[PDB]
Design a protein around this ligand. Structure first.
Ligand SMILES: CCCCCCCC/C=C\CCCCCCCC(=O)O[C@H](COC(=O)CCCCCCC/C=C/CCCCCCCC)COP(=O)(O)OCCN
Lengths: 258, 261, 98, 258, 262, 95
């Protein structure tokens, strides 16, 4: 038992340690080197469509569904004291502290996180990454490098669309439906939010969550086995490992700043 | 001279692939390294290009060594190999005209009116000139390997490595892929290393043959000398039968405990 | 280095010397307007390696000469040019065999 | 008018037969002869990869959302003397909106993507076509036990997400920052009531379990049998379920909660 | 007598056509080989016999009874007498090889557990996979996956085994096994075998009536010995492994003077 | 169609057809027929598949426990053509 339980737990300890070692060497060999700003310029805009533009449909129509639920649940419990000057706080304050960059990250890891894993894993099964390094520059700085920088730009940009629609989505259950004198909705909601606490602090969480999502989404598609079942297995592990990295770092950033 | 390995030994974490093998082919001669399925026929061509490092051994390529050079020296040697793969190794984001010109748009200094005339005659040799604007998803299994053959002859290589061609195709397009190697060798001149398993479709144009059995090279020779060779392992692969070194049954017990317990 | 062309113009004779590679075509690509101005004699005798890169510019010196009504021919060409014409299936009136 | 400007076509006929194909897939898998002893080992076997294997991403993530609900519920109630109502914010959020919506997004990410990959790999290797040939229906063999497993797992996984998230708020609210346990549980036990917080949490958990399982079993059945059709249907499962869980969350809150 | 006789069907799949007018009869106790080029509907041809799909024009019968013109309960009664296999070796992943072969005769027949253990070992010995009964199907190779599906196909004692293109990409050691397996099961069990593979020199040694399916028509209906003396350009180009013929390989599209030298 | 055996004590005259659905009256009531016979009759059978062959070998192996040498007389050609296909060894099916 002593030679069997330690050997089974010791085999998984090296394989876990070798997993992070391959992810560190993949990101280091994809960011440094010679500057190729003139060659990656048509490659960055091409990878900005399936990351930022194609993921805009899952955020815009879901942005009015977040604010309509949050605006309706945050109204009937605030009528016991004052119906006016409500719903500016607890909606815009909640969409800049916990909601927002966390909720958009679960939509980024499900739509764009699962697509970037299945795209690199399909090219590995059809022998496209091995064929590129056998005749030209290796694909670590050719197809992985424009896909990593496209995720750290779109997800901070898509969070601003998720906030502004969800703020306007909360202004539909308060205005023209059980109205709360919407002149009081403004010039007091702006007094609660400020810079470096709600506006800039929302952009801090967006850059951090964009790195830890696109790192696992580009590593599971790179370390998968070239078969039909290895791509579907790495697609499931992308949504699992990113949900534990967004909700896990949500406790990290809340206790540090707030 | 010889351009392949001399004496290597590739061994994985659990099983073994190669154990003291030797490959020798003159320049401009088509060789045929045959072998059954399940063994590492795909990873044999990866040791020449330098994708993985072997355990014990060296690969001699024109007086140089593949696992001993640096990263900048490996990219110079890799500009004249252009290894062809089994499945379609074509980029889905580009068409056929941009796939063949993809080694030409980053290595050659040809201008835009001159590059359009180079790809259009490279596709005429493989018979895919009219399908230059089509997508690789629209191509079939036979036309996908022919489009990669025109991409393989873009940078004028010296050692083309075919990784299992015409493995599951009809005999109509199977004879076309055999005929395409004969026009790319008798008119231009290039050493072709073809690994396969089918006997009567590769022993027609290749001047040398190699048989790999039990992680070792058991025999060699030519297309005509391999027929008159008394050996129990060679005569089972060529003119394939059920008996021989393969025991035809899985290793089991006494046939009295499973049946009728 | 061996990669050079060093073309010489004697009025109506173009003796393409050196080696027709894929990288020395740029001095001849910009100076191709003077090599079709009434020549009718394309000489390729000091060449040893004519690949598919140099063959593309060789077809350009004939087609731009046909716009001015010329009669360019091949005088003492290497055997590596004609064996690549049957591989790429070159038609008539773009590369004369005699 | 006949071209793609007004009568563009393939949008009224198409994407409406798929609704008819999804309706015939569920009606032929649920209505039939009663086979209780035959599907009895199939229900237990398909409960491990649906309910048991999805319990890992709920227990460790229940304390992640449960602790940030107590961090954000402290600093916003300092100047309102609501320190004794610390369980007023944690319990009411995790029983109305958080809970059955957040666990459905984790069910669509892990169990939703795995059910699409399982049926998609069976059609690629022609396992369902070979099962149909031997005088048995493949609809009531592998789809019917997978449907009833996913229906009964999500309300049984929501109550785990609630109890861990409430205990996650007790580790950051009662243990830390010095709040009395007698004042904490008095804002949870005899403050909220039945049929608004307990029954409605289990009502929407069943409807979210039907909608996620119906989408995950249709994309795995109506797919292209190739290496790229399984990865495309795995991505479309998370998109169609995130717009159906969050879309019905505004629909289901019309009757309940005022 | 015959079994199917392949009445005139079309099966137009909306955009492209699959068959125009075919007549591929299947005699009882023989080896009907239907060889043709790739890219055509050779896989979906066997689905019309089993009854998984329905054609547009005409009909198709099986031992007198019509396949599309029958009830759903009667179609499942006659589908267990075929037990066709596929190219990829369709085996269940959750169970091993022992419960794979013991799958159809468990829910249909009422053999007890000692009689069931003495039945799977008979079929696994004929294919040579008895010791691998406690092995997973995922760790099996591509050659042994087809032999495990052949023992599963002979579980319910069928009458028309449809081989959906066997040994398409296998080594010649395994290719010599599956040829001998049809020759020892057709003479002993007396079951009709249908092979739709395109390997011409391999299935012609065991077939009794070959069929050439090209250009959605029936251009040849000779036997295995009369097929080599058929004066037709569409048949001679498919056989013997030649490149040029009636099938264009140069892909003629556009003028060569327009693409070259613009 | 039925599998009624004419067991008088020395012949085991098995009649009918050996299919995969009529083995139930013979498999359960098998202990009262291997009581020292040294004989198995198969003259009134014509369809012996692999399901009926499993019940045939069960009657011979239980005879070897009590020391009975089974001699098959009047056997059909379907039994011998399946023994070479399934690779049946000696001392379990006497030829
Ligand atoms: C008068 C001043 C009032 C306070 C103003 C400042 C409030 C600041 C609050 C914002 C910052 C903290 C945010 C914490 C996170 C909130 C998120 C949340 O509440 O959940 C929402 C939805 O909201 C709910 O869960 C419903 C909450 C119901 C609350 C019920 C009342 C709670 C009572 C607390 C106050 C006590 C009142 C008694 C009076 C004493 C105090 C005055 C999630 O929406 P989903 O669509 O499910 O997201 C899906 C993707 N994750």
């Amino acid at each position: 038992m002593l030679l069997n339980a330690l050997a089974s737990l010791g085999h998984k300890g090296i394989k876990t340690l070798r997993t992070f070692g391959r992810a560190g060497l993949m990101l280091f060999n994809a960011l440094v080197g010679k500057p190729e700003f003139r060659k990656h310029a048509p490659l960055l805009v091409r990878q900005l469509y399936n990351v930022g533009v194609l993921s805009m449909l899952i955020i815009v129509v879901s942005g009015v569904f977040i604010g309509m639920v949050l605006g309706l649940q945050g109204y009937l419990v605030l009528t016991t004291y004052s119906a006016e000057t409500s719903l500016g706080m607890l909606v815009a304050l909640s969409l800049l502290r916990e909601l927002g960059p966390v909720v958009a990250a679960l939509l980024f890891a499900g739509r764009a996180g699962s697509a970037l894993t299945a795209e690199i894993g399909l090219m590995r099964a059809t022998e496209q990454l091995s064929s590129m390094e056998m005749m030209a520059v290796d694909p670590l700085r050719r197809v992985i490098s424009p896909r990593f920088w496209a995720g750290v730009i779109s997800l901070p940009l898509l969070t601003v669309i998720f906030v502004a629609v969800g703020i306007w989505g909360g202004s539909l259950v308060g205005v023209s439906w059980k109205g709360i004198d919407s002149g009081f909705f403004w010039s007091a909601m702006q007094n609660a939010v400020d810079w470096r606490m709600d506006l800039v602090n929302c952009l801090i969480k967006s850059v951090v969550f964009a790195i830890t999502v696109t790192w696992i989404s580009l590593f599971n598609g790179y370390d998968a086995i070239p078969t039909s079942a290895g791509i579907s297995r790495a697609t499931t592990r992308t949504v699992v490992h990113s949900s534990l990295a967004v909700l896990g770092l949500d406790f990290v950033l809340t206790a540090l700043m707030f | 001279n010889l351009v392949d390995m001399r004496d290597v030994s590739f061994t994985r974490g659990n099983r073994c692939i190669f154990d003291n093998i030797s490959l020798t082919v003159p320049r401009g001669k088509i060789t045929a390294i045959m072998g059954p399925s399940g063994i590492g026929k795909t990873t044999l061509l990866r040791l020449i290009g330098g994708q993985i490092a072997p355990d014990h051994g060296e690969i001699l390529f024109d007086g140089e060594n593949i696992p001993a050079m640096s990263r900048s020296r490996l990219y110079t040697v890799r500009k004249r190999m252009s290894m062809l793969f089994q499945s379609g190794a074509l980029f889905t984001d580009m068409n056929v005209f941009d796939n063949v010109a993809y080694p030409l748009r980053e290595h050659t200094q040809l201008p835009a009116p001159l590059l359009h005339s180079t790809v259009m005659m490279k596709l005429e040799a493989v018979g895919l000139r009219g399908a230059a604007k089509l997508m690789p998803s629209e191509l079939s299994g036979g036309m996908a390997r022919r489009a990669a053959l025109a991409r393989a002859i873009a940078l004028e290589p010296d050692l083309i490595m075919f990784d299992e061609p015409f493995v599951g195709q009809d005999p109509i397009t199977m004879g076309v892929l055999v005929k395409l190697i004969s026009e790319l060798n008798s008119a231009l001149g290039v050493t072709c290393v073809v690994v396969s398993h089918d006997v009567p479709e590769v022993l027609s144009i290749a001047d040398h043959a190699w048989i790999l059995a039990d992680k070792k090279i058991v025999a060699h020779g030519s297309a005509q000398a391999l027929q008159a060779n008394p050996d129990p392992r060679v005569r089972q692969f060529l003119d394939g039968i059920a008996d021989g070194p393969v025991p035809f049954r899985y290793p089991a017990g006494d046939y009295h405990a499973d049946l009728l317990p | 280095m061996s990669e050079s062309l060093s073309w010489m113009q004697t009025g109506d004779t173009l003796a393409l010397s050196g080696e027709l590679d894929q990288d020395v075509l740029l001095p001849l690509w910009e100076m191709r307007e003077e090599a079709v101005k009434g020549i009718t004699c394309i000489d390729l005798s000091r060449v040893s390696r004519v690949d598919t890169g140099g063959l593309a510019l060789l077809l350009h010196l004939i087609d731009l000469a046909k716009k001015q009504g010329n009669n360019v021919t091949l005088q003492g060409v290497n055997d590596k040019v004609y064996t690549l014409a049957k591989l790429y299936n070159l038609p008539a009136d773009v590369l004369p065999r005699h």
